[PDB]
Amino acid sequence: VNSFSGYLKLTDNVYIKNADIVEEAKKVKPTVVVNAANVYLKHGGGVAGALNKATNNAMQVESDDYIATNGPLKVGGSCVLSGHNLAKHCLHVVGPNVNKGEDIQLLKSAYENFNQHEVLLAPLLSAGIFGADPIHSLRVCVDTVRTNVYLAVFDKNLYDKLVSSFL
Numbered sequence: 812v813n814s815f816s817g818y819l820k821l822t823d824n825v826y827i828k829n830a831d832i833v834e835e836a837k838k839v840k841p842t843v844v845v846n847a848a849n850v851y852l853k854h855g856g857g858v859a860g861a862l863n864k865a866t867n868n869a870m871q872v873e874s875d876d877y878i879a880t881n882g883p884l885k886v887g888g889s890c891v892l893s894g895h896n897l898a899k900h901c902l903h904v905v906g907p908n909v910n911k912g913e914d915i916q917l918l919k920s921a922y923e924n925f926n927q928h929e930v931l932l933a934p935l936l937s938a939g940i941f942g943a944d945p946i947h948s949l950r951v952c953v954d955t956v957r958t959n960v961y962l963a964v965f966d967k968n969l970y971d972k973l974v975s976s977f978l
């Protein structure tokens with residue numbers, strides 16, 4: 812048994828809810844929250860900007876030190892950093908950004924990072940301002956992630972379309 816409430820059961824391991832991820836993280840304090848990161852860990856907008864603002868910019872300060880030491884992530888890659896006031900850990904995962912021309916086949920590689928964690932609170936990778944089709948992102952998630960994932964979708968209209976269209 813875990814602390815997540817009102818998530819709609821999709822599969823054996825994937826759950827979905829129309830919710831503000833900042834607000835969900837603040838309430839649950841999950842072991843892992845996933846950030847929709849870019850390779851530079853520059854959290855200006857989307858899930859990344861929303862999460863970083865909720866940490867009072869401590870996520871960005873930590874991220875800048877990580878990049879200064881290690882250099883940029885790979886598209887499809889990840890790193891584990893602090894969850895600050897939101898979670899124990901933040902898994903920063905880089906899905907491909909269609910609005911930068913990145914290979915959408917890297918979306919499966921991105922979701923494979925989730926399998927290193929038994930339970931996660933996450934957004935749909937490559938959805939929203941990343942330019943991918945969120946229906947596609949949900950299909951890759953279900954077909955890739957084997958660990959228990961609680962998906963928070965910010966937009967109500969998109970949530971309803973994702974549930975209604977789910978195969």
Ligand SMILES: Nc1ncnc2ccccc12
Pocket residue numbers: 830831832833856857858861939965
């Ligand atoms: N949860 C969010 N709060 C504010 N802005 C956002 C932008 C994209 C996704 C989620 C959020």
